[PDB]
Design a binder for this molecule. Structure first.
Ligand SMILES: O=C(O)CNC(=O)C(=O)O
Ligand SMILES: [Mg+2]
Ligand code: NI
Ligand SMILES: [Zn+2]
Length: 331
């Protein structure tokens, strides 16, 4: 069995290997990359996402989200308070202000220590989940707006044509902005490109160990667990690496820098934080290997998770027994 320790693997495809996206995902899986839940892909040196980032300041962040924490430094939840709209140029100025800027630090490990010590005492503002793309239309390789759609994959594998669309999302971050422990909708893959700015630190649990994380989360967030049998779908809970290690949960960590892709694999729980002002683009995708994970994905039906239009068909076709309850939670 390849990669039996479930380490995060880093790949360096050549320009020739960068042509066929599906083929390269299958290659990484042949080497056991999915066992980690997360992989890094460094693009060939010849490649670029677009010519420059000099003209992005007028993008609008319609609903910036202030991420307010509750709990203790290593075990906390966050809620999102909506703020007034602002442009990317306004948000970048805010991120660089004395109130929000990255503190002085020695290295990524020092900054990580400072994040876990101090995150809860601040409320950073995240420009998340903005429909759009920063890839040039002329970029033919690993262009996250030009991927095969998940609806087309389901149709190819299973023979059933479904409604829905699959487009990318932009994320504008600042120091301490945080992504809570989660798997993707329907336990899909994700791909994330860090277009510019400061790094993103990731934590990940191997897919084969995801239920260990879920059992710890039920213990640590006992009211939330009574409220919902899949409350990690709410995307609000944080658990630090120190707490994971104290409780014997297998995990790994890695820092993504500008110009690098990350792929999350089906049922790979992940969480993390941004180092400073940055912009990322991410989208969900599927492969044949995903179908069995889609069929078994948990679902929130309490009303909290609320998701896109396109998830309806995935539930309806892959999980018909669950459909009626889940749809009630959507309405
Ligand atoms: O970058 C972020 O805030 C969150 N991204 C992801 O969870 C992802 O790409 O799957
Ligand atoms: Mg602009
Ligand atoms: Ni994700
Ligand atoms: Zn729920």
């Amino acid at each position: 069995a390849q990669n039996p320790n479930c380490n995060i693997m880093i790949f360096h495809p050549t320009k020739e290997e960068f042509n066929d996206f599906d083929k390269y995902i299958a290659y990484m899986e042949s080497q056991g990359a999915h066992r980690a839940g997360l992989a890094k892909i460094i693009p060939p040196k010849e490649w670029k996402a677009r010519e420059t980032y000099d003209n992005i300041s007028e993008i609008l962040i319609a609903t910036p989200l202030q991420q307010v924490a509750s709990g203790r430094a290593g075990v906390f939840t966050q809620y999102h308070k909506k703020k007034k709209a602002m442009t990317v140029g306004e948000y970048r100025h805010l991120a660089n202000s004395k109130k929000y800027q990255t503190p002085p630090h020695q290295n990524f490990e020092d900054l990580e220590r400072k994040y876990w010590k101090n995150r809860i005492y601040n409320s950073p503002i995240y420009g998340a989940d903005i429909s759009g793309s920063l890839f040039d239309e002329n970029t033919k390789q690993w262009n996250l707006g030009h991927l095969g759609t998940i609806q087309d994959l389901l149709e190819k594998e299973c023979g059933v044509v479904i409604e829905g669309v699959n487009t990318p999302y932009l994320y504008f971050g600042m120091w301490k902005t945080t992504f809570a422990w989660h798997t993707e909708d329907m336990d899909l893959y994700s791909i994330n490109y860090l277009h510019l700015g400061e790094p993103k630190t990731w934590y990940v649990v191997p897919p084969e160990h995801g239920q260990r994380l879920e059992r710890l989360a039920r213990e640590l967030f006992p009211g939330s667990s009574r409220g919902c049998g899949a409350f990690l779908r709410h995307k609000v809970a944080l658990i630090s690496p120190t707490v994971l290690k104290e409780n014997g949960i297998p995990f790994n960590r890695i820092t993504q820098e500008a110009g690098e892709f990350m792929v999350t694999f089906p049922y790979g729980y992940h969480a993390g934080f941004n180092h400073g002002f940055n912009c990322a683009e991410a989208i969900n995708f599927a492969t044949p290997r995903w179908i069995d994970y889609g069929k078994m994905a948990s679902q929130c039906s309490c009303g909290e998770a609320r998701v896109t239009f396109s998830m309806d068909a995935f539930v309806r076709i892959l999980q018909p027994e669950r459909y009626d309850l889940w749809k009630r939670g959507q309405d």
